[PDB]
RNA sequence: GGACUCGGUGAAAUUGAAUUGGCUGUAAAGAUGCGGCCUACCCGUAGCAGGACGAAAAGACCCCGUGGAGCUUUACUAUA
RNA sequence: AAGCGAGUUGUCUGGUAGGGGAGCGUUCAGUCCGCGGAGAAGCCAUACCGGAAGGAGUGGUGGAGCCGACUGAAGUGCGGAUGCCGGCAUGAGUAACGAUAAAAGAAGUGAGAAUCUUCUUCGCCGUAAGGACAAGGGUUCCUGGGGAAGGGUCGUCCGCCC
RNA sequence: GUCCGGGAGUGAGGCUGCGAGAGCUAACUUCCGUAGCCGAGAGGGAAACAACCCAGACCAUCAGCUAAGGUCCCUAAAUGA
RNA sequence: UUUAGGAGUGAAAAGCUAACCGAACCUGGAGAUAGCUAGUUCUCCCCGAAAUGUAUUGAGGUACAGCCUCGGAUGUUGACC
RNA sequence: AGCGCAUAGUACCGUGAGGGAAAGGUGAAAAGAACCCCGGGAGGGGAGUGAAAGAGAACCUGAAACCGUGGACUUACAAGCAGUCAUGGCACCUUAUGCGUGUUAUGGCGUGCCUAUUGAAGCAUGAGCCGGCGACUUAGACCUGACGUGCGAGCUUAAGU
């Protein structure tokens, strides 16, 4: 029992913006190892999300949790939520603009890869317990 | 390119250098229009009617304050123009005296000024 | 008014005998429990089936002249040496390693049989080593 | 070692560059035959 | 020069069963010796800088 | 020095679709989804070739085609 | 006022080249009183009917129109033509980073620094992989500056870009 | 029983019966005609499987019987005389 | 730097003219035309086949006739017994 | 889509005359935006702007193979690309009405479509998918013929007004 007639509204008056919000596309790494520092944190933030990712024999906290923390940086007072909550309900990304650029190979008629890219995705609004 | 000027209008209102009106169209029909330039070939305007709020930034130039007056948006001329009175009969017509610069005499009801 | 699949619940089947093998109903009365004794409400489709209590049947011995031999066979594809046919009396080493092997020919098609081969279960040894399988032990001397 | 053509064109000057088919007067028509026969700009000047 | 080319494919179904016999091996073990807590197999902090004793640096 | 620990990049030839084991048989007879039977706890990666009638251009060896081109001979005949 | 059948008996067979025959609907056009702001047209889904194709009940979302019966017109309808482009692909994260002609580090910096910078130690060429003239690229060289992207890691280095 | 016409097809089949032809009466080789069959429709029997015994359908009913095939089981049906 | 296209070069291979010359490329003449062959789009109600003969520098090419549908028709002429 | 050009026949392909793109769209109007955060920045917060910012400073609505996660349910001891029904099995009950919605161990068994093929179900071939193009017609007294109509003594071209 929120809002249906007049459509003019939902335009006009809203507010807002879009609770949450971080993702700074790009990531360069394919959307199917994005997910991959994602499916593993399914619970506690920079808590028991962090060193689970900022600690792991490799790189992937660089841009994979210092932007996934951009959203805090927003959430800090730009965005709702609080500290000691937070939650991020799943998790979810695809592709994006590339840039053609190649380097010969050999054999053939012509040789065609893509440099590839994704959208990172990091959200933090609405949530659940308290 | 911002599309809002409202050049689709067509360039043949007549308007120029003082000059007191009211205003329609909705938004306020509280606001006497007045004074102004105009923008022959596009045309640009505001007047009081509508209350922006756009804040500048402060560098080191000589800005530093903001504002929040005196901006633009859009809405042209087609409110409510002309008739020293208020309402009814045109005024596009003209003296036989030549002087298009600012020929003076309008309709039945209308004015030399 | 149908049936329903106990899932393991209602069954009460009856320890086979072994008391003396014999020569028509003995690789056929594999049946007459398995698929249906009596039947309390055997749901077809899946399968259903009893504790087929096999006993010793060492007393197994076959047709007369035409004893050590049978239709022995192994399929691997290859026939230039596999599909060792022993004889009965050749391949008399297991004689509990075949005999219930009497139901390659009641199975459903494609599992259900292919699941009773627990039932069977070896044993040749005359009521003793009953470790394998504790619970039934009702009888009921065979027609 | 030698490809199939390398640098220096003096024979797309006086022979087969801007004017030079005059010389050829059936070839003003073929130096015309892009120019004011059909679309196009030129090939001798980009 | 070219060996029996891809044909038939491998996407869904498959390709699934894949992320279980790796995966990651799941951790959390040990939590440092004394203060805070990291210590990794059995590797002394950075904070306190100690297994049990003098090492390391804030 | 490559095959294995780790960070980034990762394409092409190709291709209906895989709960993609086998026999013996059957089928326009070279069957793994067919027959009848036996059989495996499911998955990952290293490595190997029997395997899909392996891949590529719809054999160009050949024949069919009142196809072409190419050379020769006193082939019918033009012709400097 | 454009032709239509129960009551019934055989046929109502299944049909590949084919004969007679009905339509669903989109675009163009006729008549537009029109249908839509509670918003239709764009689209996503719910067991009414239809010979099939399809027509139906409602929101969702979306933003300005849209189709109708009687009608004629139109490049009127395969996913499928080893087609063509545009995008997503998978071979798959393996093979590979390039001629296998050694490198460690102090320190500058700062966002952390292993490949920059001030530098002691090592080694490969040095009839060379030196420097000038020849063709070429035209912006290489600098005062230097920033990662979007490129240099097939990337980087605070370029002769990227100003 | 009875012709004129708008327009087909694509010409290169297979098998059992009926008999020969080339033929160690051999060949889902090859020539022929004559019923059927598959090129244009499914099954039981036949292990499943184009011509073989029975049978060619308007869509819907977990209603009946006939022929083949079967009357021990895996999936029907008297180890009845 | 002239030679060039149906010519030159040439150590003869029948090699090359600019990564294939059994006679260069590009704009142009026609799409070489094609009985070859891939295909030729939404959903249907009742009917229905030939690889037999005649023709062919003619054969899986094509023509026609028995062989299908439809308009008209054939007032006793049907096939079985 | 339409000429390739709705501001490009850019760069160029390159041995040479000679061959060339792909690509449009925010609302009327940008008002394309001051003000504290992680960060190098790109990218993301507050909040006005915005009638309407799930237009959104590579921008209408925005269906889809591939691709992003969870969940009500089943599943590694069960075997066939797939199938349809079949008793069960967890869920739901937009009408207690032992009646269904989202489904599956398993059973009968059962082999794909296109489509040049006598002929198969094939391993005979064509096919990873998405979006479109998707052809015997168009002018021609070229002609024959169904139906409706004009007439029985019948019907018209060239353009002149």
């Not at chain 1, 962090?50 to 800090?76: C, G, T, W």
């Not at chain 3, 698929?35 to 049947?57: E, L, S």
């Not at chain 3, 459903?108 to 080593?129: C, D, N, W």
């Not at chain 5, 990794?40 to 804030?58: E, M």
Request: proline share 6%.
């Amino acid at each position: 029992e929120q809002t249906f007639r007049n459509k003019k509204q939902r335009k006009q008056q809203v507010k807002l913006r879009k609770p949450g919000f971080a993702v700074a596309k790009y990531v360069r790494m394919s959307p199917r190892k994005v997910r991959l520092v994602v499916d593993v944190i399914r619970g506690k933030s920079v808590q028991d999300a962090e060193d689970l990712l900022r600690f792991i024999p490799r790189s992937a906290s660089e841009p994979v949790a210092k932007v996934l923390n951009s959203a805090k940086a927003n959430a800090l007072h730009n965005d709702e939520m609080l500290e000691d909550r937070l939650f991020v309900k799943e998790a979810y990304v695809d592709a994006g603009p590339t840039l053609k650029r190649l380097i010969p190979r050999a054999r053939g008629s012509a040789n065609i890869i893509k440099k590839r890219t994704s959208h990172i995705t990091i959200i933090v609004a609405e949530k659940g317990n308290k | 390119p911002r599309p809002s000027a409202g050049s689709h209008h067509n360039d043949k209102l007549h308007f120029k250098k003082g000059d007191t009106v009211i205003v329609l169209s909705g938004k306020h029909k509280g606001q006497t229009g007045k004074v102004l330039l105009a923008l022959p070939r596009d045309q640009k305007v505001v007047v009081e009617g509508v209350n922006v709020i756009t804040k500048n930034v402060k560098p080191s130039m000589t800005n530093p304050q903001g504002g929040q007056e005196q901006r633009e948006l859009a809405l042209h001329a087609s409110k409510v123009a002309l008739v020293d009175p208020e309402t009814g009969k045109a005024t596009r017509v003209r003296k036989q005296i030549v002087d298009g610069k600012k020929v003076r005499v309008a309709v039945a009801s209308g004015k030399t000024i | 008014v149908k049936t329903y699949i106990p899932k393991n619940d209602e069954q009460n089947w009856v320890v086979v005998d072994a008391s003396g093998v014999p020569l028509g109903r003995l690789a056929t009365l594999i049946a007459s429990r398995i698929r249906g004794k009596h039947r309390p409400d055997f749901t077809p489709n899946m399968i259903q089936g009893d504790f087929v209590v096999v006993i010793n049947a060492a007393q197994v011995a076959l047709t007369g002249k035409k004893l050590d031999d049978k239709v022995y066979t192994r399929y691997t594809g290859y026939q230039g040496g596999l599909k060792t046919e022993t004889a009965r009396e050749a391949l008399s080493k297991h004689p509990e390693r075949v005999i219930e092997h009497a139901v390659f020919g009641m199975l459903p098609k494609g599992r259900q049989g292919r699941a009773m081969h627990t039932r069977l279960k070896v044993y040749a040894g005359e009521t003793h080593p009953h470790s394998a399988q504790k619970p039934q032990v009702l009888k009921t001397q065979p027609l | 070692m030698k490809r199939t053509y390398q640098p220096n064109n003096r024979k797309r000057a006086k022979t087969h560059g801007f004017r030079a088919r005059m010389k050829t007067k059936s070839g003003r028509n073929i130096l015309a035959r892009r120019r004011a026969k059909g679309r196009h700009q030129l090939t001798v000047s980009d | 020069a070219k060996h029996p080319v891809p044909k038939k494919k491998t996407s869904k179904s498959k390709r699934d069963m894949r992320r279980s016999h790796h995966a990651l091996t799941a951790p959390n073990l040990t939590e440092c010796p004394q203060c805070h807590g990291k210590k990794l197999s059995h590797h002394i902090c950075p904070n306190c800088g100690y297994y049990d004793g003098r090492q390391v640096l804030a």
